[PDB]
């Protein structure tokens, strides 16, 4: 019954997820894995269904990690969905500054894919700006992809001076 829950959470079927999650006894089916190691929390956050991920948090789910170290907030910021992002941020705050296997945070992905409101949402909260495995900040990773709107909304922010301070003198790429 794991594959119907993965299909119903991967496409925003809220009533099918309510009918599958009536038995509140066994939570081993709720936090189960995938072939690529994704919980239904990860699938519901990847496609950007806020009510499904709110239901899975209300029933009780654990912020596990992908095989590549991603989180639900990493998928929601890779997609640029502000609603699931806002729900995950309103539940907990200890999941924001979280690293993947490559050292990227969620703000790195939200700036790499060029989502302005996602960057503004993680930036209005405390984002804990850190470098990459290749010593790249999120501002570097936005400038190399020529994303005009996200670097403009970094400039319009209040954290801009702080965003200017951090880089690597030794790194030949992010000069």
């Amino acid at each position: 019954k794991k594959s119907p829950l993965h299909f119903a959470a991967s496409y925003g079927r809220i009533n099918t997820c309510q009918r599958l999650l009536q038995d509140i006894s066994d939570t081993r089916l709720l936090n189960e894995g995938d072939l690529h190691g994704m919980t239904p929390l990860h699938l519901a956050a990847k496609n950007g269904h806020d009510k499904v991920v709110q239901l899975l948090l209300k029933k009780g789910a654990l912020f596990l990690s992908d095989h590549n170290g991603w989180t639900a907030l990493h998928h929601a910021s890779m997609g640029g969905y502000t609603q699931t992002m806002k729900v995950i941020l309103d539940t907990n705050l200890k999941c924001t500054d979280r690293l993947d296997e490559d050292g990227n945070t969620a703000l790195h992905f939200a700036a790499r894919e060029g989502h302005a409101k996602a960057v503004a949402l993680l930036l209005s909260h405390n984002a804990d700006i850190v470098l990459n495995k290749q010593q790249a900040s999120f501002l570097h990773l936005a400038l190399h992809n020529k994303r005009k709107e996200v670097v403009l909304t970094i400039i319009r922010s209040k954290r801009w001076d702080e965003c200017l301070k951090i880089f690597s003198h030794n790194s030949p790429g992010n000069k």
Partner: peptide, 16 residues
Amino acid sequence: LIKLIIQKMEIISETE
């Protein structure tokens, strides 16, 4: 609109 179609679609005899 297409994602809304899949969200509201009725699936019988194609599940699991």
